[PDB]
Each structure stands twice: as structure tokens, then as C-alpha cells.
From Swiss-Prot:
Listed name of the protein: Macrophage metalloelastase
Keywords in alphabetical order: Calcium, Disulfide bond, Extracellular matrix, Glycoprotein, Hydrolase, Metal-binding, Metalloprotease, Protease, Repeat, Secreted, Signal, Zinc, Zymogen
Annotated positions binding Zn(2+) 2: H113, H117, H123
Binding annotation for Ca(2+) 3: D70, G71, G73, I75, D93, E96
Shown residues in whole-protein numbering: 106 to 263 of 470
Claim: Transcription is one of the keywords in the record: no
Gene for this chain: MMP12
GO cellular component: cytoplasm; extracellular matrix; extracellular region; extracellular space; nucleus
Tissue specificity: Found in alveolar macrophages but not in peripheral blood monocytes.
Subcellular location: Secreted, Extracellular space, Extracellular matrix
Protein source organism: Homo sapiens
Chain coiled-coil ranges: none
Physiological role: May be involved in tissue injury and remodeling. Has significant elastolytic activity. Can accept large and small amino acids at the P1' site, but has a preference for leucine. Aromatic or hydrophobic residues are preferred at the P1 site, with small hydrophobic residues (preferably alanine) occupying P3.
Length: 158
């Protein structure tokens, strides 16, 4: 599948969930990109204007693509693989309740998984991997990529 053919990648947060403090949204997404730059040659930068490689969106229901959201629960988020336009973009379901913690849905952990998709990673069958296809909460202050995640991303970059 496609991969980014460049080392400097930009992102942009299109809008903010009302579920969280703004600076906490900024930090969760930043930390989530950091998980992947930790183990690859990629560098991620947040821009506040113009076109970014990865647009970060909060939206509910039908939101202008072919991956409608489904209300609270079920699908939490989705992301497009590397490429032009909507490629790379990561959408988060506003009908979920995003948090910094174990309540509602953890935005950081979700974003790590979704940014894996934005970078061109598929799913792992290992329940310990962040790329396992089903959301499972782990403590975020001690989060670490599984060895399966690392081999997956390192198969694509670096
Ligand atoms: C359009 C969707 C069907 C695909 C999407 N779905 S998801 O919201 O169910 C999702 C989100 C996060 C995870 C996840 C798994 C492990 C750790 C952290 C997040 C898994 C599934 C996904 O796999 O990213
Ligand atoms: Ca949902
Ligand atoms: Ca894009
Ligand atoms: Ca919400
Ligand atoms: Zn979408
Ligand atoms: Zn997934």
C-alpha cells in the first residue's frame, strides 16, 4: 500500500471537539504523532493554515466522505491512507466523548491507531498491538508500541 515518500509531514487540526480542553486536544494529537516519529525517520509539524498532509477532523454522522459515523459507540474514528487530498486525513466521531483519561474514549490512544492508518499501516491480529482492529484502553502515561507495531511501521519506513 501507499506510504509517504517524504520525511517532513504536516498536520492541521481542522476543528476541536467541545468534549475536551483545547490545549489537551493539541497535546493528545501531538503525543500520538510522536509515538510514530519515535520509531521512524518521519518528522511531524502542526500548521494552522493552508493544506496539511494530515487533516484532523471532528465530525458526526454523514460528513462528506463515504465513511459515515454511527452515533455514540461502534465506530470511533477512521483515517485514509497516504496520498493526495483526503489521503492521510483522520476523522474522529463527535458522538463519542473524547478524554485525556480512562473515561469516555481516549483521544490519544485512538489517534495513535488512526495515525497508523494515515501512515499506511493495516491491522494486527495481536490483541496487544495498538493496530489491533478493536479499541482497548491502556494507561496512556505508560503507553508503549507493541513489538508487532514497531515491525509493521518499520516495514514501511526506515
Ligand atoms: C471505519 C472503521 C470501521 C475503521 C476504524 N474503526 S474503529 O473506530 O473501530 C477503531 C478505532 C480505534 C481502534 C484502536 C485499537 C487498538 C488500540 C487503540 C485504538 C480500533 C478500531 C479503524 O480501524 O480505525
Ligand atoms: Ca460512533
Ligand atoms: Ca490529506
Ligand atoms: Ca463528543
Ligand atoms: Zn470521515
Ligand atoms: Zn483500524
Amino acid at each position: 500500500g501507499p506510504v509517504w515518500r517524504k520525511h517532513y509531514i504536516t498536520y492541521r487540526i481542522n476543528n476541536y471537539t467541545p468534549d475536551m480542553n483545547r490545549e489537551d486536544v493539541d497535546y493528545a494529537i501531538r503525543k500520538a504523532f510522536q509515538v510514530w516519529s519515535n520509531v521512524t525517520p518521519l518528522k511531524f509539524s502542526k500548521i494552522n493554515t493552508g493544506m496539511a498532509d494530515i487533516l484532523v477532523v471532528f465530525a458526526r454522522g454523514a460528513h462528506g466522505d463515504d465513511h459515515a459515523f454511527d452515533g455514540k459507540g461502534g465506530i470511533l474514528a477512521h483515517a485514509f491512507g497516504p496520498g493526495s487530498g483526503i489521503g492521510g486525513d483522520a476523522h474522529f466521531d463527535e458522538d463519542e466523548f473524547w478524554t485525556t483519561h480512562s473515561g469516555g474514549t481516549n483521544l490519544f490512544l485512538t489517534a495513535v491507531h488512526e495515525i497508523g492508518h494515515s501512515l499506511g499501516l493495516g491491522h494486527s491480529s495481536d490483541p496487544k498491538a495498538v493496530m489491533f482492529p478493536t479499541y482497548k484502553y491502556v494507561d496512556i502515561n505508560t503507553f508503549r508500541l507493541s513489538a508487532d507495531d514497531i515491525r509493521g511501521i518499520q516495514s514501511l519506513y526506515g
